[PDB]
Amino acid sequence: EVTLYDLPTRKEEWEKKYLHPEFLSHLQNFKDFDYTEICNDVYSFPLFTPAFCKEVIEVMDKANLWSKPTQDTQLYEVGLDKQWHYVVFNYVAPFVRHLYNNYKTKDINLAFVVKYDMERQSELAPHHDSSTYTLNIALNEYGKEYTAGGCEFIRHKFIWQGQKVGYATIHAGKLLAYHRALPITSGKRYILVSFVN
Amino acid sequence: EVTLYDLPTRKEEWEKKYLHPEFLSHLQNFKDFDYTEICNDVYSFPLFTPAFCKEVIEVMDKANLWTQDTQLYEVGLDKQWHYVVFNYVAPFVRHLYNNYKTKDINLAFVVKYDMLAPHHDSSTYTLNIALNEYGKEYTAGGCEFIRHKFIWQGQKVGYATIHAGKLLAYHRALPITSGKRYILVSFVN
Ligand SMILES: [Fe+2]
Ligand SMILES: [Fe+2]
Protein backbone atom coordinates (compact mmCIF):
# COMPACT_ATOMS: atom_id res chain seq x y z
CA GLU A 1 0.00 0.00 0.00
CA VAL A 2 1.11 3.56 -0.73
CA THR A 3 2.72 5.55 2.09
CA LEU A 4 3.29 9.25 2.74
CA TYR A 5 6.80 9.02 1.24
CA ASP A 6 5.68 7.64 -2.16
CA LEU A 7 5.11 11.06 -3.74
CA PRO A 8 5.50 11.52 -6.63
CA THR A 9 6.68 7.95 -7.37
CA ARG A 10 3.20 6.53 -6.76
CA LYS A 11 1.50 9.87 -7.27
CA GLU A 12 -2.01 8.85 -8.37
CA GLU A 13 -2.34 6.33 -5.53
CA TRP A 14 -0.94 8.99 -3.19
CA GLU A 15 -3.52 11.56 -4.31
CA LYS A 16 -6.51 9.24 -3.89
CA LYS A 17 -5.40 8.20 -0.40
CA TYR A 18 -4.10 11.49 1.01
CA LEU A 19 -5.69 14.39 -0.90
CA HIS A 20 -9.24 15.34 0.03
CA PRO A 21 -11.57 14.32 -2.83
CA GLU A 22 -13.08 17.81 -3.12
CA PHE A 23 -9.70 19.52 -3.51
CA LEU A 24 -8.37 16.89 -5.92
CA SER A 25 -11.52 17.05 -8.06
CA HIS A 26 -11.13 20.85 -8.42
CA LEU A 27 -7.40 21.00 -9.19
CA GLN A 28 -8.18 22.58 -12.59
CA ASN A 29 -11.31 24.56 -11.63
CA PHE A 30 -11.29 26.24 -8.21
CA LYS A 31 -14.20 28.48 -9.25
CA ASP A 32 -16.71 25.93 -7.95
CA PHE A 33 -14.44 24.70 -5.13
CA ASP A 34 -16.25 24.68 -1.77
CA TYR A 35 -14.01 26.97 0.25
CA THR A 36 -14.98 29.55 2.86
CA GLU A 37 -13.64 33.04 3.52
CA ILE A 38 -13.82 32.97 7.32
CA CYS A 39 -12.57 36.57 7.41
CA ASN A 40 -11.16 39.10 4.96
CA ASP A 41 -8.53 37.41 2.75
CA VAL A 42 -8.39 34.35 5.05
CA TYR A 43 -9.72 31.11 3.60
CA SER A 44 -10.57 27.66 4.96
CA PHE A 45 -10.82 24.69 2.61
CA PRO A 46 -10.46 20.89 2.62
CA LEU A 47 -7.05 19.69 1.48
CA PHE A 48 -6.09 16.32 3.00
CA THR A 49 -7.89 13.14 4.09
CA PRO A 50 -8.14 11.85 7.67
CA ALA A 51 -5.67 9.09 6.76
CA PHE A 52 -3.09 11.73 5.83
CA CYS A 53 -3.44 13.48 9.18
CA LYS A 54 -3.36 10.25 11.21
CA GLU A 55 -0.25 8.97 9.44
CA VAL A 56 1.54 12.33 9.80
CA ILE A 57 0.84 12.24 13.54
CA GLU A 58 2.05 8.62 13.78
CA VAL A 59 5.33 9.51 12.05
CA MET A 60 5.89 12.48 14.36
CA ASP A 61 4.98 10.66 17.58
CA LYS A 62 7.19 7.67 16.73
CA ALA A 63 10.14 9.90 15.80
CA ASN A 64 9.86 11.83 19.11
CA LEU A 65 12.06 14.64 17.80
CA TRP A 66 9.93 17.41 19.35
CA SER A 67 11.69 20.59 20.42
CA LYS A 68 12.11 20.83 24.19
CA PRO A 69 8.91 27.48 23.07
CA THR A 70 6.31 25.56 21.07
CA GLN A 71 6.64 21.79 20.70
CA ASP A 72 7.22 21.07 17.01
CA THR A 73 9.11 18.87 14.56
CA GLN A 74 10.24 19.91 11.09
CA LEU A 75 9.09 17.84 8.12
CA TYR A 76 12.69 17.45 6.95
CA GLU A 77 13.60 15.84 10.29
CA VAL A 78 11.46 12.86 9.22
CA GLY A 79 12.44 12.97 5.54
CA LEU A 80 9.25 14.52 4.15
CA ASP A 81 10.72 17.74 2.73
CA LYS A 82 10.76 16.63 -0.91
CA GLN A 83 7.21 15.29 -0.66
CA TRP A 84 6.03 18.54 0.93
CA HIS A 85 7.78 20.57 -1.78
CA TYR A 86 5.85 18.60 -4.40
CA VAL A 87 2.60 19.18 -2.48
CA VAL A 88 3.17 22.95 -2.29
CA PHE A 89 4.32 23.55 -5.87
CA ASN A 90 1.73 21.29 -7.54
CA TYR A 91 -1.40 21.38 -5.35
CA VAL A 92 -1.30 24.46 -3.11
CA ALA A 93 0.39 26.87 -5.52
CA PRO A 94 -2.37 26.61 -8.19
CA PHE A 95 -4.97 27.31 -5.49
CA VAL A 96 -2.97 30.32 -4.27
CA ARG A 97 -3.05 31.80 -7.78
CA HIS A 98 -6.84 31.46 -7.82
CA LEU A 99 -7.22 32.97 -4.34
CA TYR A 100 -4.66 35.78 -4.53
CA ASN A 101 -4.70 37.14 -8.10
CA ASN A 102 -2.19 34.76 -9.72
CA TYR A 103 0.51 35.19 -7.06
CA LYS A 104 3.44 32.93 -7.98
CA THR A 105 4.86 30.69 -5.25
CA LYS A 106 8.63 31.23 -4.95
CA ASP A 107 10.02 28.91 -2.26
CA ILE A 108 9.25 27.22 1.06
CA ASN A 109 10.72 28.75 4.22
CA LEU A 110 9.68 26.20 6.86
CA ALA A 111 7.25 23.32 7.32
CA PHE A 112 6.57 21.61 10.62
CA VAL A 113 4.03 19.85 12.83
CA VAL A 114 3.13 21.59 16.11
CA LYS A 115 1.94 19.54 19.09
CA TYR A 116 0.07 21.46 21.79
CA ASP A 117 -0.46 19.44 24.96
CA MET A 118 -1.11 20.06 28.65
CA GLU A 119 2.41 18.99 29.69
CA ARG A 120 4.26 21.88 28.01
CA GLN A 121 2.88 25.41 28.33
CA SER A 122 4.29 28.28 26.28
CA GLU A 123 3.64 31.94 25.62
CA LEU A 124 1.37 32.33 22.59
CA ALA A 125 2.22 35.94 21.79
CA PRO A 126 0.82 37.94 18.85
CA HIS A 127 3.13 37.95 15.85
CA HIS A 128 3.50 38.18 12.10
CA ASP A 129 4.76 35.18 10.18
CA SER A 130 8.06 35.08 8.29
CA SER A 131 6.25 34.18 5.08
CA THR A 132 4.27 35.58 2.20
CA TYR A 133 1.40 33.23 3.04
CA THR A 134 0.99 30.65 5.79
CA LEU A 135 -0.68 27.24 5.52
CA ASN A 136 -2.23 25.74 8.68
CA ILE A 137 -3.67 22.21 8.48
CA ALA A 138 -5.59 20.71 11.39
CA LEU A 139 -4.37 17.16 11.99
CA ASN A 140 -6.77 15.96 14.73
CA GLU A 141 -10.35 16.57 15.76
CA TYR A 142 -11.60 19.42 17.92
CA GLY A 143 -13.79 18.27 20.82
CA LYS A 144 -12.87 14.60 20.42
CA GLU A 145 -9.14 14.92 21.17
CA TYR A 146 -8.78 18.46 22.57
CA THR A 147 -10.80 21.43 23.79
CA ALA A 148 -10.45 25.21 23.32
CA GLY A 149 -7.50 26.05 21.06
CA GLY A 150 -7.80 27.88 17.78
CA CYS A 151 -6.37 31.10 16.40
CA GLU A 152 -7.26 34.76 16.97
CA PHE A 153 -6.83 37.04 13.95
CA ILE A 154 -6.27 40.27 15.83
CA ARG A 155 -6.57 42.72 12.93
CA HIS A 156 -9.74 40.99 11.68
CA LYS A 157 -11.14 40.76 15.25
CA PHE A 158 -11.96 37.15 14.39
CA ILE A 159 -11.34 33.95 16.36
CA TRP A 160 -11.12 30.73 14.33
CA GLN A 161 -11.67 27.54 16.33
CA GLY A 162 -12.81 23.99 15.69
CA GLN A 163 -11.09 23.45 12.34
CA LYS A 164 -12.00 20.12 10.75
CA VAL A 165 -9.52 17.29 10.24
CA GLY A 166 -7.66 17.67 6.96
CA TYR A 167 -8.99 21.19 6.37
CA ALA A 168 -6.46 23.97 5.85
CA THR A 169 -6.41 27.65 6.75
CA ILE A 170 -4.41 30.03 4.55
CA HIS A 171 -3.64 33.64 5.44
CA ALA A 172 -1.07 36.33 4.76
CA GLY A 173 2.21 36.05 6.64
CA LYS A 174 3.16 39.69 7.06
CA LEU A 175 1.52 43.07 7.61
CA LEU A 176 -2.16 42.13 7.32
CA ALA A 177 -2.80 38.96 9.37
CA TYR A 178 -1.54 39.75 12.87
CA HIS A 179 -2.54 36.73 14.92
CA ARG A 180 -1.85 34.57 17.95
CA ALA A 181 -2.46 30.93 18.72
CA LEU A 182 -4.92 30.18 21.47
CA PRO A 183 -4.08 27.58 24.12
CA ILE A 184 -5.91 24.31 24.48
CA THR A 185 -7.45 23.37 27.82
CA SER A 186 -7.61 19.58 27.36
CA GLY A 187 -6.01 16.77 25.38
CA LYS A 188 -3.63 17.28 22.48
CA ARG A 189 -3.78 19.29 19.25
CA TYR A 190 -1.65 18.63 16.16
CA ILE A 191 -1.35 21.10 13.28
CA LEU A 192 0.80 21.21 10.15
CA VAL A 193 2.21 24.70 9.54
CA SER A 194 4.13 25.85 6.47
CA PHE A 195 5.67 29.27 5.85
CA VAL A 196 5.77 29.86 2.08
CA ASN A 197 7.37 32.82 0.32
CA GLU B 1 19.70 76.95 1.85
CA VAL B 2 18.98 73.41 3.07
CA THR B 3 18.78 70.83 0.28
CA LEU B 4 17.43 67.32 -0.17
CA TYR B 5 20.88 65.89 0.58
CA ASP B 6 21.24 67.54 4.02
CA LEU B 7 19.54 64.70 5.92
CA PRO B 8 20.38 63.95 8.64
CA THR B 9 23.18 66.55 8.92
CA ARG B 10 20.62 69.37 9.03
CA LYS B 11 17.67 67.26 10.14
CA GLU B 12 15.59 69.94 11.88
CA GLU B 13 15.67 72.24 8.84
CA TRP B 14 15.20 69.29 6.47
CA GLU B 15 12.01 68.25 8.27
CA LYS B 16 10.47 71.73 8.18
CA LYS B 17 11.14 72.29 4.48
CA TYR B 18 10.44 68.78 3.16
CA LEU B 19 8.18 66.87 5.59
CA HIS B 20 4.49 67.72 5.40
CA PRO B 21 3.46 69.60 8.57
CA GLU B 22 0.50 67.32 9.34
CA PHE B 23 2.81 64.30 9.23
CA LEU B 24 5.65 66.05 11.06
CA SER B 25 3.35 67.22 13.88
CA HIS B 26 2.01 63.68 14.44
CA LEU B 27 5.24 61.64 14.46
CA GLN B 28 4.83 60.72 18.15
CA ASN B 29 1.00 60.52 18.11
CA PHE B 30 -0.52 59.01 14.97
CA LYS B 31 -3.88 58.53 16.73
CA ASP B 32 -4.98 62.05 15.73
CA PHE B 33 -3.26 61.88 12.32
CA ASP B 34 -5.81 62.59 9.58
CA TYR B 35 -5.20 59.78 7.11
CA THR B 36 -7.74 58.12 4.82
CA GLU B 37 -8.41 54.42 4.24
CA ILE B 38 -9.31 54.71 0.56
CA CYS B 39 -9.89 50.95 0.38
CA ASN B 40 -9.38 48.14 2.88
CA ASP B 41 -5.82 48.26 4.28
CA VAL B 42 -4.77 50.94 1.76
CA TYR B 43 -4.08 54.35 3.29
CA SER B 44 -3.56 57.80 1.79
CA PHE B 45 -1.87 60.44 3.94
CA PRO B 46 0.23 63.61 3.64
CA LEU B 47 3.96 62.98 3.80
CA PHE B 48 6.02 65.56 1.91
CA THR B 49 5.78 69.26 1.05
CA PRO B 50 5.46 70.73 -2.46
CA ALA B 51 9.08 71.88 -2.21
CA PHE B 52 10.25 68.29 -1.74
CA CYS B 53 8.33 67.05 -4.78
CA LYS B 54 9.45 69.87 -7.09
CA GLU B 55 13.10 69.49 -6.08
CA VAL B 56 12.98 65.70 -6.50
CA ILE B 57 11.67 66.11 -10.05
CA GLU B 58 14.29 68.75 -10.87
CA VAL B 59 17.03 66.37 -9.72
CA MET B 60 15.61 63.59 -11.90
CA ASP B 61 15.04 65.80 -14.96
CA LYS B 62 18.58 67.21 -14.78
CA ALA B 63 20.16 63.78 -14.25
CA ASN B 64 18.31 62.32 -17.28
CA LEU B 65 19.08 58.73 -16.29
CA TRP B 66 15.70 57.29 -17.34
CA THR B 67 8.71 51.50 -16.66
CA GLN B 68 10.79 54.60 -17.38
CA ASP B 69 12.32 55.26 -13.96
CA THR B 70 15.44 56.41 -12.10
CA GLN B 71 16.65 54.79 -8.89
CA LEU B 72 17.41 57.09 -5.97
CA TYR B 73 21.00 55.85 -5.63
CA GLU B 74 21.70 57.01 -9.20
CA VAL B 75 21.33 60.60 -7.93
CA GLY B 76 22.94 60.05 -4.52
CA LEU B 77 19.74 60.01 -2.45
CA ASP B 78 19.67 56.40 -1.20
CA LYS B 79 21.10 57.21 2.24
CA GLN B 80 18.63 60.08 2.65
CA TRP B 81 15.75 57.78 1.70
CA HIS B 82 16.92 55.09 4.13
CA TYR B 83 16.75 57.65 6.94
CA VAL B 84 13.25 58.70 5.82
CA VAL B 85 11.92 55.13 5.79
CA PHE B 86 13.34 53.98 9.13
CA ASN B 87 12.77 57.19 11.12
CA TYR B 88 9.49 58.52 9.66
CA VAL B 89 7.65 55.83 7.68
CA ALA B 90 8.47 52.82 9.86
CA PRO B 91 6.75 54.20 13.01
CA PHE B 92 3.65 54.97 10.95
CA VAL B 93 3.67 51.45 9.48
CA ARG B 94 3.63 50.01 13.01
CA HIS B 95 0.59 52.15 13.82
CA LEU B 96 -1.22 51.07 10.64
CA TYR B 97 -0.27 47.40 10.43
CA ASN B 98 -0.18 45.97 13.96
CA ASN B 99 3.41 46.86 14.90
CA TYR B 100 4.99 45.33 11.78
CA LYS B 101 8.73 45.99 11.89
CA THR B 102 10.36 47.30 8.72
CA LYS B 103 13.31 45.05 7.84
CA ASP B 104 15.05 46.62 4.83
CA ILE B 105 14.52 48.62 1.63
CA ASN B 106 14.41 46.76 -1.69
CA LEU B 107 14.04 49.59 -4.23
CA ALA B 108 13.40 53.33 -4.32
CA PHE B 109 12.89 55.16 -7.60
CA VAL B 110 11.00 57.90 -9.43
CA VAL B 111 8.73 56.95 -12.35
CA LYS B 112 7.96 59.39 -15.17
CA TYR B 113 4.84 58.80 -17.28
CA ASP B 114 4.69 60.84 -20.50
CA MET B 115 3.20 60.67 -23.99
CA LEU B 116 0.72 49.10 -17.66
CA ALA B 117 0.16 45.47 -16.64
CA PRO B 118 -1.37 44.23 -13.38
CA HIS B 119 1.19 42.93 -10.92
CA HIS B 120 2.25 42.30 -7.36
CA ASP B 121 5.12 44.32 -5.94
CA SER B 122 8.37 42.74 -4.76
CA SER B 123 7.93 44.09 -1.24
CA THR B 124 6.10 43.61 2.02
CA TYR B 125 4.56 47.06 1.59
CA THR B 126 4.86 49.71 -1.10
CA LEU B 127 4.97 53.51 -0.76
CA ASN B 128 3.68 55.68 -3.61
CA ILE B 129 4.02 59.48 -3.46
CA ALA B 130 2.49 61.76 -6.08
CA LEU B 131 5.14 64.29 -7.13
CA ASN B 132 3.21 66.67 -9.42
CA GLU B 133 -0.30 68.04 -9.63
CA TYR B 134 -3.22 66.16 -11.16
CA GLY B 135 -5.16 68.30 -13.63
CA LYS B 136 -2.43 70.95 -13.93
CA GLU B 137 0.60 69.00 -15.20
CA TYR B 138 -1.21 65.83 -16.32
CA THR B 139 -4.70 64.42 -16.83
CA ALA B 140 -6.28 61.03 -16.03
CA GLY B 141 -3.64 58.62 -14.68
CA GLY B 142 -3.83 57.06 -11.25
CA CYS B 143 -4.02 53.48 -10.02
CA GLU B 144 -6.53 50.64 -9.83
CA PHE B 145 -6.46 48.16 -6.95
CA ILE B 146 -7.86 45.13 -8.75
CA ARG B 147 -8.62 42.93 -5.73
CA HIS B 148 -10.25 45.89 -3.95
CA LYS B 149 -12.19 46.88 -7.11
CA PHE B 150 -11.24 50.49 -6.41
CA ILE B 151 -10.03 53.17 -8.83
CA TRP B 152 -7.68 55.68 -7.19
CA GLN B 153 -7.14 58.93 -9.10
CA GLY B 154 -6.16 62.50 -8.31
CA GLN B 155 -3.59 61.97 -5.56
CA LYS B 156 -2.47 65.31 -4.15
CA VAL B 157 1.12 66.55 -4.34
CA GLY B 158 3.24 65.23 -1.48
CA TYR B 159 0.58 62.75 -0.35
CA ALA B 160 1.50 59.09 -0.09
CA THR B 161 -0.35 55.83 -0.70
CA ILE B 162 0.72 52.74 1.24
CA HIS B 163 -0.42 49.20 0.46
CA ALA B 164 0.76 45.61 0.67
CA GLY B 165 3.28 44.61 -1.96
CA LYS B 166 2.59 40.90 -2.36
CA LEU B 167 -0.54 38.75 -2.28
CA LEU B 168 -3.19 41.20 -1.07
CA ALA B 169 -3.00 44.28 -3.31
CA TYR B 170 -2.97 43.31 -6.99
CA HIS B 171 -2.83 46.63 -8.81
CA ARG B 172 -1.92 48.40 -12.04
CA ALA B 173 -1.26 51.96 -13.14
CA LEU B 174 -3.80 53.88 -15.20
CA PRO B 175 -2.70 55.72 -18.35
CA ILE B 176 -2.52 59.50 -18.55
CA THR B 177 -4.12 61.48 -21.36
CA SER B 178 -1.74 64.48 -21.45
CA GLY B 179 1.28 65.99 -19.74
CA LYS B 180 3.72 64.22 -17.44
CA ARG B 181 3.17 62.26 -14.22
CA TYR B 182 5.94 61.78 -11.64
CA ILE B 183 5.69 59.39 -8.69
CA LEU B 184 8.15 58.30 -6.01
CA VAL B 185 7.92 54.55 -5.37
CA SER B 186 9.64 52.47 -2.70
CA PHE B 187 9.48 48.70 -2.23
CA VAL B 188 10.05 47.99 1.48
CA ASN B 189 10.41 44.56 3.07
FE1 LIG C 1 1.77 32.25 13.07
FE1 LIG D 1 3.42 48.62 -8.41
Query: Determined by which method?
Result: X-ray
Q: Does the active-site annotation cover B172? A: no
Contacts of B21 (CB under 8 A, 6+ apart): B49
Quote the distance between the C-alpha of residue B109 and its chain's center.
10
Which CA distances in Å does B66 have to A156, B59, B126, B131, B133?
Answer: 42, 12, 21, 16, 21
Instruction: Name A77's bridge partners.
Output: none
What is the DSSP code (8-state) at residue B101? P
Whether the CB-CB separation of B183 and B158 falls below 8 Å is answered with no
Judge residue B36's burial from the number of C-beta atoms within 10 Å of its C-beta, 0-12 exposed, 13-18 middle, 19 or more buried.
Answer: exposed
b/e A81-106 (16+ beta carbons within 10 angstroms → b): eebbbebbeebbeebbeebbbebebe
Which CA distances in Å does A70 have to A63, A141, A180, B98?
Answer: 17, 20, 13, 23
Domain boundaries, given as residue ranges, for chain A: 1-197
Of A101, A172, A174, the CB nearest to B146: A101
Of A126, A154, A174, the CB nearest to B124: A174
Instruction: Name residue A153's amino acid.
Output: F
Neighbours of A163 (CB within 10 A): 22
Instruction: Name A21's bridge partners.
Output: none
Nearest to A20 by CA among A60, A52, A58: A52
Whether the CB-CB separation of A166 and A49 falls below 8 Å is answered with yes
A129 annotated binding-site participant: yes
Give A10→chain B minimum CA distance, Å: 33
Q: Do A103 and B167 touch (CB under 8 A)?
A: yes
Q: Say what angle helices B50-63 and B11-18 make with each other, to 10 degrees.
A: 100
Residues in chain A closer than 8 A to B100 (CB atoms):
128, 174-175, 178
Q: Is the dihedral of CA B38, B44, B50, B54 positive or negative?
A: negative
Whether the CB-CB separation of A184 and A147 falls below 8 Å is answered with yes
Give A179→chain B minimum CA distance, Å: 10
Whether the CB-CB separation of B108 and B115 falls below 8 Å is answered with no
After which residues does chain B have a break in its backbone, defined as C to next N over 2.5 Å?
A: 66, 115
Residue B100 forms contact with A (CB below 8 Å): yes
Contacts of A133 (CB under 8 A, 6+ apart): A96, A100, A103, A170, A171, A172, A173, A196, B167
Q: What is the distance between the alpha carbons of residues B8 and B18, in angstroms, rounded to a whole number?
A: 12
